[PDB]
Write a protein that holds these residues in place. Sequence first.
Motif, PDB file in Angstrom:
ATOM      1  N   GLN A  90       0.853  -1.183   0.000  1.00  0.00           N
ATOM      2  CA  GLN A  90       0.000   0.000   0.000  1.00  0.00           C
ATOM      3  C   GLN A  90       0.900   1.248   0.000  1.00  0.00           C
ATOM      4  N   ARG A  92       1.028   5.579  -0.448  1.00  0.00           N
ATOM      5  CA  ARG A  92       0.256   6.817  -0.513  1.00  0.00           C
ATOM      6  C   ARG A  92       1.179   8.054  -0.572  1.00  0.00           C
ATOM      7  N   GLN A 179      -3.726   7.053  -3.129  1.00  0.00           N
ATOM      8  CA  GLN A 179      -3.290   5.742  -2.698  1.00  0.00           C
ATOM      9  C   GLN A 179      -3.304   4.741  -3.868  1.00  0.00           C
ATOM     10  N   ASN A 181      -2.611   0.324  -4.377  1.00  0.00           N
ATOM     11  CA  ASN A 181      -2.333  -0.967  -3.760  1.00  0.00           C
ATOM     12  C   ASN A 181      -2.083  -1.996  -4.850  1.00  0.00           C
TER      13      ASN A 181
END
Length: 225
Positions: A90, A92, A179, A181
């Motif tokens: 993840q 960001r 973000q 992922n």
Amino acid sequence: SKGEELFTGVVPILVELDGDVNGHKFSVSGEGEGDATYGKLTLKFICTTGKLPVPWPTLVTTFVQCFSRYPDHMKRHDFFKSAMPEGYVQERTIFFKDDGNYKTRAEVKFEGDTLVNRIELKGIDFKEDGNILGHKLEYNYNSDNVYIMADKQKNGIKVNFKIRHNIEDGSVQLADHYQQNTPIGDGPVLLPDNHYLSTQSALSKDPNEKRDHMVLLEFVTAAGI
């Protein structure tokens, strides 16, 4: 699919973060449990290096969307649980309006029966006396809806959302989140149609804890389909 089964009961959670914001170095450990069937998270974080140099609410989004409650009709869009147990990466960028930005990189995956979120956070360009390094943010959090979109190119998801932190003077400190992922495995994952995660977060303190910390209780449900 596929972590689906891994989440039917209460799962212990561990969070570890190493941060450096404008050269102020700090570490945080968090423990608790998630019960995805009810979209419930209960956690307590401790700053293990002395006082936290940024306000606790600024770190909530960084500190495991696999605990969201996906209605049975939406299970096919649950990218987060599908990536388990191998996990997902993840990343960001969080831009604090009129202030600095945090860049984070985390890995979320199982270690045995424990769901672990290990993060590295780097913050730069903060104003020494701004709302962040100056600690001018209230110890509370607003409810919200974030829009998950599939990122077919990387076989992951991407999200872009705004979080508003309340400033002590009645005003708001916007934190714009971008973000992305992607799965850690080579494993298959479920790519979702567009939908939202609705979250509510309550912050509190452990009357018996003398270290700098944060007690966090959240409920999150996916919807929009």
